[PDB]
Ligand binder design. Structure first.
Ligand SMILES: Nc1nc(=O)c2ncn(CC(COCP(=O)(O)O)COCP(=O)(O)O)c2[nH]1
Ligand SMILES: Nc1nc(=O)c2ncn(CC(COCP(=O)(O)O)COCP(=O)(O)O)c2[nH]1
Ligand SMILES: [Mg+2]
Ligand SMILES: [Mg+2]
Lengths: 179, 185
């Protein structure tokens, strides 16, 4: 494996970007009759969870390439506006269920969701994102904005950490606790 | 002789000042200096990362690109947004998309110093050195621009254009027209 701290790379940055371009084409098609324009009527991107800044930064630029202008708001007026909620990972769906339900109360013209990583096996309630870049199984991943204990968000790929990473850090946490 | 001037890429811009490629080239140069400068600190994921404090809403683009480049150069980070975890005894690098009057960074740095970080430095994507209202020098600057209003690379005009990949001069046409519309509202 490329990374000394990982056992597996699941998706490279290049694979993610290729899938993101395919999703951007669909979004450009789906919103083509919405008359989106900078200033007068951008697509409102609502980015949810701290780590989603990486995905949001790459995705709004790719959407711009495909002719979909955006404004961004972070959750870490939309009445009559088109809203696309972005999140780095969708797992239990408890976050997005709450965010979507709250945004609906402001009566946007439409609301859809776009997630970089779906763990469809992780649900605690039923929830389907309109747009999914990639799926993973029920494993804990880091990278592409996703962290372990606030570290590793900067890893360019989505990866599975080595067990020794959690073990060393637990032990150091114990150590610092006693001292 | 007759000079030929090609038209600008973007219908809303007068001039592209820095392309995404130029920005990333300069960010790699800066990342090498940062790696050299923090090589004496024994930084590590989890036990001792560099705390990146990202300031202002539009700085998410710069921050996303910069933490990944720093990772390539072996500088592990953790990111915090001001648009705060304990920083006492930690190295802090404050990131900001643009530095102009310096009033934001002066306040942010002074506040953070109260928590006694191990060190504090600043890294900015665009410095407008002629815009100062107080003296201020960033430790690390990706690019300088003259006193003109730019958008792109996370910088907005009234919340639009952050997604433009290049840093560009916004056409006066755009904000004169839109400004009167906002007045009308
Ligand atoms: N780093 C990381 N990797 C995972 O595989 C993973 N699976 C769940 N989570 C925690 C969180 C994701 O935390 C993401 P962040 O650090 O705040 O970007 C799941 O929240 C989505 P949901 O369960 O409400 O739908 C994960 N965090
Ligand atoms: N979009 C944009 N372009 C500029 O040229 C420019 N020059 C100043 N500003 C406004 C703000 C930058 O606003 C950045 P953002 O939309 O919140 O990412 C200057 O703040 C830095 P300082 O004056 O405290 O040092 C600008 N905003
Ligand atoms: Mg997390
Ligand atoms: Mg602004």
């Amino acid at each position: 494996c490329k990374y000394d701290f990982a056992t597996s790379v699941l998706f490279t940055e290049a694979e993610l970007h290729t899938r993101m371009r395919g999703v951007a084409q669909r979004i450009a098609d789906d919103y083509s009759n919405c008359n989106l324009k900078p200033l007068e009527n951008p697509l409102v991107i609502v980015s949810v969870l701290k780590g989603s800044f990486v995905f949001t930064a790459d995705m709004v630029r790719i959407l711009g390439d495909f002719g979909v202008p955006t404004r961004v708001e972070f959750l870490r007026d939309i009445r009559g506006k088109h809203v696309l909620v972005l999140e780095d990972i969708l797992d239990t769906a408890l976050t997005l269920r709450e965010v979507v339900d709250s945004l609906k109360k402001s009566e946007p013209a439409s609301i859809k969701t776009l997630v970089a990583i779906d763990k469809p096996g992780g649900r605690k309630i039923p929830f389907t994102a309109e747009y999914v870049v990639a799926d993973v199984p029920n494993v804990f991943v880091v990278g592409y904005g996703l962290d372990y204990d606030q570290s590793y968000r900067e890893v360019r790929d989505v990866v599975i950490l080595k067990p020794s990473v959690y073990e060393t850090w637990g032990k150091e946490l114990e150590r610092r606790k006693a001292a």
